[PDB]
Amino acid sequence: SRILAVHASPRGERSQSRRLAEVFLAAYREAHPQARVARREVGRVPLPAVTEAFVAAAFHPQPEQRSLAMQADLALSDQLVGELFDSDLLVISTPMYNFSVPSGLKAWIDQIVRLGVTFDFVAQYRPLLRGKRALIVTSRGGHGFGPGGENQAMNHADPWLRTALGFIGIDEVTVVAAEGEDSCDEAEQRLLALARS
Amino acid sequence: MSRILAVHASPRGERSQSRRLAEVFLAAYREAHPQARVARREVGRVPLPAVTEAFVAAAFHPQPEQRSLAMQADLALSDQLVGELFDSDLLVISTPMYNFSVPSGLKAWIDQIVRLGVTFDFVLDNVAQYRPLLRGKRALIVTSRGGHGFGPGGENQAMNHADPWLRTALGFIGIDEVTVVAAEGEESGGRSFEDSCDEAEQRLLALARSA
Amino acid sequence: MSRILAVHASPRGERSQSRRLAEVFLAAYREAHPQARVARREVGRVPLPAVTEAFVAAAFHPQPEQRSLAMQADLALSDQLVGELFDSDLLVISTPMYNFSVPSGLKAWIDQIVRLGVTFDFVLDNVAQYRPLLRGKRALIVTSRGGHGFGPGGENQAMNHADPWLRTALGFIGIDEVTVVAAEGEESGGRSFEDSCDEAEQRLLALARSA
Amino acid sequence: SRILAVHASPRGERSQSRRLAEVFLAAYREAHPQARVARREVGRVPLPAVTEAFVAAAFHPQPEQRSLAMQADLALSDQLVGELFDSDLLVISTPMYNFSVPSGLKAWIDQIVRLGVTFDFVAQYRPLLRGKRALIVTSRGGHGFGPGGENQAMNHADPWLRTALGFIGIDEVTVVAAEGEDSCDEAEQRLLALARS
Numbered sequence: 001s002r003i004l005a006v007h008a009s010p011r012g013e014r015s016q017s018r019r020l021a022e023v024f025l026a027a028y029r030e031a032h033p034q035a036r037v038a039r040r041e042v043g044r045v046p047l048p049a050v051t052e053a054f055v056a057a058a059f060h061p062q063p064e065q066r067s068l069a070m071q072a073d074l075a076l077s078d079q080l081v082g083e084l085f086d087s088d089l090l091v092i093s094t095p096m097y098n099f100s101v102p103s104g105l106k107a108w109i110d111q112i113v114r115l116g117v118t119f120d121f122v123a124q125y126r127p128l129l130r131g132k133r134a135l136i137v138t139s140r141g142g143h144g145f146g147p148g149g150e151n152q153a154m155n156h157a158d159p160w161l162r163t164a165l166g167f168i169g170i171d172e173v174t175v176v177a178a179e180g181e182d183s184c185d186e187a188e189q190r191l192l193a194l195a196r197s
Numbered sequence: 198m199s200r201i202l203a204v205h206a207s208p209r210g211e212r213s214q215s216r217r218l219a220e221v222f223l224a225a226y227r228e229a230h231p232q233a234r235v236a237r238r239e240v241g242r243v244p245l246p247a248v249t250e251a252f253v254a255a256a257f258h259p260q261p262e263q264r265s266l267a268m269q270a271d272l273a274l275s276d277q278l279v280g281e282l283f284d285s286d287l288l289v290i291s292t293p294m295y296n297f298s299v300p301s302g303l304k305a306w307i308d309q310i311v312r313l314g315v316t317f318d319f320v321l322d323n324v325a326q327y328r329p330l331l332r333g334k335r336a337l338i339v340t341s342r343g344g345h346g347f348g349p350g351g352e353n354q355a356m357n358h359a360d361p362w363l364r365t366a367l368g369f370i371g372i373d374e375v376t377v378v379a380a381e382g383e384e385s386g387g388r389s390f391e392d393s394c395d396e397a398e399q400r401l402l403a404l405a406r407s408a
Numbered sequence: 409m410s411r412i413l414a415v416h417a418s419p420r421g422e423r424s425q426s427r428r429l430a431e432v433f434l435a436a437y438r439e440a441h442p443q444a445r446v447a448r449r450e451v452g453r454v455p456l457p458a459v460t461e462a463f464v465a466a467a468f469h470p471q472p473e474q475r476s477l478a479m480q481a482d483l484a485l486s487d488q489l490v491g492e493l494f495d496s497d498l499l500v501i502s503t504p505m506y507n508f509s510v511p512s513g514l515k516a517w518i519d520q521i522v523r524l525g526v527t528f529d530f531v532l533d534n535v536a537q538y539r540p541l542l543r544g545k546r547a548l549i550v551t552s553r554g555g556h557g558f559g560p561g562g563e564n565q566a567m568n569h570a571d572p573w574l575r576t577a578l579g580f581i582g583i584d585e586v587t588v589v590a591a592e593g594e595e596s597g598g599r600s601f602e603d604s605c606d607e608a609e610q611r612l613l614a615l616a617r618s619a
Numbered sequence: 620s621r622i623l624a625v626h627a628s629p630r631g632e633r634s635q636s637r638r639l640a641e642v643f644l645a646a647y648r649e650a651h652p653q654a655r656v657a658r659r660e661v662g663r664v665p666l667p668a669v670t671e672a673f674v675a676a677a678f679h680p681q682p683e684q685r686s687l688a689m690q691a692d693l694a695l696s697d698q699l700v701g702e703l704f705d706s707d708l709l710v711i712s713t714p715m716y717n718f719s720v721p722s723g724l725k726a727w728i729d730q731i732v733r734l735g736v737t738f739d740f741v742a743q744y745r746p747l748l749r750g751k752r753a754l755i756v757t758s759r760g761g762h763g764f765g766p767g768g769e770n771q772a773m774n775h776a777d778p779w780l781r782t783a784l785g786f787i788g789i790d791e792v793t794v795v796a797a798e799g800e801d802s803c804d805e806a807e808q809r810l811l812a813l814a815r816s
């Protein structure tokens with residue numbers, strides 16, 4: 001059982017989403033002693049944004065012909081994609097920042113959605129990832145951003161992740177949210193339950 | 198004469214359609230308002246710093262005037278970015294749709310300019326109650342998308358977390374007069390994209406002539 | 409009353425000795441010159457963009473006035489950084505020694521402000537002949553090092569590629585009046601570092617009182 | 620024979636140092652068909668600068684006690700160091716930018732000089748890398764920056780690299796420089812000779 005854990009909060013010890021995610025990971029490890037966890041930090045480390053060079057390389061009509069410089073432009077992307085390919089369960093921890101996700105997490109997504117690698121087209125688009133599942137652990141300052149919540153329509157954090165993840169083939173996605181920064185305890189207890197299965 | 202702040206979020210240069218269309222609007226605006234001020238803030242071709250833990254600590258410091266000089270340094274870019282907004286009457290954001298949202302640099306720009314006590318505030322009616330601090334401003338969002346149907350009524354409307362999300366974040370700080378001009382079909386190109394770009398230009402020219 | 413530009417290159421905040429010592433100088437300068445302008449440019453706690461290929465293409469464009477708007481965007485930060493320098497009479501750089509040189513952010517700041525036709529130029533006496541374009545400026549470099557002997561006469565002088573290198577880069581654009589104030593022994597601390605910091609402060613106070 | 624190639628120019632096809640380095644690498648591969656080359660791009664990709672968090676983690680008095688967040692702060696560094704450990708020959712290509720190296724290369728060095736990993740102290744310092752050699756391939760706009768050159772004392776590019784590399788244990792270092800951007804041809808031919816041995 002291989003887990004990729006992507007932490008999106010820039011905060012360390014003080015991060016609630018990171019802490020909850022780590023509570024899940026620890027419980028998961030207890031119940032699956034053989035598990036491996038890979039951590040990809042995108043909160044405390046400045047992940048590069050997509051550049052024009054990246055666009056030219058990633059959408060190259062004949063990728064086998066990419067120059068060495070273009071391959072260099074894609075090397076981080078390839079590494080990030082590889083972590084995803086090698087994992088069965090993707091865990092993403094993230095704050096809501098301004099009704100969406102921290103910019104580093106947007107940057108991660110922008111690196112791993114890759115034509116001919118995690119999606120393709122025939123234009124109609126097709127996902128290429130299979131057999132993967134994801135758990136999103138998110139913390140929010142306010143309230144009512146969840147399903148049936150008063151502010152659901154303002155939530156462009158996790159519902160957006162579902163869209164992007166869905167596009168590349170990850171369609172089994174669970175969200176666990178703590179709001180009001182009781183809800184945390186319900187999340188933590190929800191996570192322990194999820195981990196022991 | 199509205200003072201304009203243009204925020205360009207495509208990493209692409211001459212080839213950016215979102216940038217190009219926004220520049221059509223700005224030039225046309227300039228023609229009708231020779232003395233109007235236009236400031237440009239690049240967030241696409243320039244890596245804009247993400248929000249860090251030090252930024253959070255400074256921005257949310259309970260006694261703001263007591264921030265160390267180091268903390269002030271952590272907010273210096275934010276202060277510059279916010280200042281540009283305060284100086285402007287009309288905000289123009291040019292942006293691609295990247296993976297059903299905006300490029301990460303634009304997200305980072307937003308994260309820098311939503312500032313407690315500066316562009317929004319709150320009181321405790323225990324239950325924090327938020328209030329926007331920007332007034333008298335308007336925004337124009339000029340966007341380009343590879344595919345089709347991300348606009349209202351579109352087959353893929355629910356997947357659109359780019360401009361609808363921008364409208365929400367801007368509304369939070371008090372910019373609720375927001376217009377969206379979108380070109381679609383950029384990936385397929387053809388003459389359907391030419392028409393879409395043509396319509397976008399005509400729309401932008403009308404807007405510029407009346408702003 | 410010299411206008412001052414302070415460029416802080418340590419990633420550390422309250423704990424930065426190089427920053428602290430420079431702030432001692434600035435405060436003391438302020439006390440003697442209440443109306444003096446002081447601008448701070450953070451290059452340590454803020455990731456400053458490296459020079460890119462697009463920057464090179466724009467900065468070295470043979471017809472500069474013909475740069476596209478995208479190219480101008482590529483130089484916008486550089487223009488801001490250069491402008492700060494032009495506005496100043498005295499430049500104060502605070503910097504650690506990091507691996508026998510300066511932190512990468514400070515190197516990036518330098519790479520942004522050495523600009524053809526702006527802070528230096530050249531003619532072809534074929535064999536390019538360079539000329540600095542900054543005049544009437546002075547620099548003060550305040551530095552802190554973990555070890556000892558990196559100064560003149562020091563056992564490790566030849567390993568020092570921090571301030572001696574800064575002096576060379578600044579000289580290239582026309583700042584040849586450069587003073588270096590160094591504290592050493594920061595890693596060992598003890599009372600040898602206390603003395604070194606004390607001497608640095610006394611030196612900086614004298615400089616501030618006469619600048 | 621394992622090679623780590625660190626390219627420092629932000630320029631792609633147009634980069635002279637990159638091109639010369641690749642001429643060497645190709646020739647080296649011809650003569651040592653079993654060779655492996657790892658490429659670490661630090662010119663066209665924004666390598667993060669050392670931060671206060673990095674300092675706190677890297678100089679932690681009791682590293683085995685580092686929190687997960689601190690380990691995250693060091694994960695890139697650990698990866699960069701690992702590439703170095705796994706290599707026999709380090710090749711660095713770099714422009715001279717303002718009498719030194721591009722800032723990305725300074726940032727790389729700042730990630731790989733690591734207490735207890737590539738150097739230690741007993742204070743007296745001690746290198747920890749062994750059996751490695753390096754080749755620096757550098758391109759300069761001007762002239763006379765080499766040994767015995769009129770401008771030698773202004774050169775804080777490769778002579779500085781020697782210092783930093785020397786500090787962690789890489790003391791067999793060769794510099795091949797092209798100046799005046801004939802010298803290139805002499806470098807290229809110098810590189811082919813070096814590669815066939």
Ligand SMILES: Cc1cc2nc3c(=O)[nH]c(=O)nc-3n(C[C@H](O)[C@H](O)[C@H](O)COP(=O)(O)O)c2cc1C
Nearest residue numbers: 009015016017095096097098099139140141142181
């Ligand atoms: C820059 C920033 C933006 C935020 N935006 C929102 C928001 O849009 N909606 C919300 O409910 N809370 C918002 N918050 C509050 C955080 O979501 C809340 O503190 C969350 O628990 C932080 O996650 P973390 O503990 O993992 O760092 C924001 C906080 C910060 C620092």
Ligand SMILES: Cc1cc2nc3c(=O)[nH]c(=O)nc-3n(C[C@H](O)[C@H](O)[C@H](O)COP(=O)(O)O)c2cc1C
Nearest residue numbers: 207213214215293294295296297341342343344383
């Ligand atoms: C990294 C990347 C992600 C993209 N994601 C989407 C997308 O999610 N939906 C879509 O319709 N088009 C998408 N596109 C296509 C672009 O939106 C389209 O090419 C757009 O014109 C780019 O804006 P620009 O021309 O101003 O640079 C994407 C393009 C890139 C390079």
Ligand SMILES: Cc1cc2nc3c(=O)[nH]c(=O)nc-3n(C[C@H](O)[C@H](O)[C@H](O)COP(=O)(O)O)c2cc1C
Nearest residue numbers: 418424425426504505506507508552553554555594
């Ligand atoms: C990444 C790093 C590299 C360093 N390299 C050197 C060095 O090469 N020589 C030296 O004497 N001290 C070195 N030091 C020690 C620092 O120069 C010293 O702690 C200095 O005070 C840092 O400056 P600051 O206090 O303003 O942050 C290094 C420290 C760090 C964190």
Ligand SMILES: Cc1cc2nc3c(=O)[nH]c(=O)nc-3n(C[C@H](O)[C@H](O)[C@H](O)COP(=O)(O)O)c2cc1C
Nearest residue numbers: 628634635636714715716717718758759760761800
């Ligand atoms: C930002 C910048 C700084 C430079 N600084 C120097 C310098 O200090 N001394 C020098 O001789 N040439 C300098 N040059 C010229 C370059 O070193 C020369 O173009 C070199 O061949 C570029 O390397 P590359 O072809 O691998 O990109 C500089 C060039 C640039 C773009």
Ligand SMILES: NC(=O)N/N=C/c1ccc([N+](=O)[O-])o1
Nearest residue numbers: 098099141142143151311327
């Ligand atoms: N009910 C709400 O609108 N809650 N919003 C919380 C937010 C949004 C932005 C921030 N912020 O601190 O930046 O807090």
Ligand SMILES: NC(=O)N/N=C/c1ccc([N+](=O)[O-])o1
Nearest residue numbers: 113114125296297343344345
């Ligand atoms: N989803 C669509 O129908 N059209 N958009 C095309 C996309 C989506 C993602 C990307 N991408 O390049 O990452 O292109």
Ligand SMILES: NC(=O)N/N=C/c1ccc([N+](=O)[O-])o1
Nearest residue numbers: 507508554555556732733744
């Ligand atoms: N070289 C010395 O004698 N003292 N300096 C200490 C150093 C050198 C490099 C580092 N470092 O932390 O990377 O510390």
Ligand SMILES: NC(=O)N/N=C/c1ccc([N+](=O)[O-])o1
Nearest residue numbers: 522538717718760761762770
């Ligand atoms: N003989 C010289 O001083 N040569 N210097 C060349 C340089 C230094 C900086 C630049 N530059 O283009 O930035 O070129």
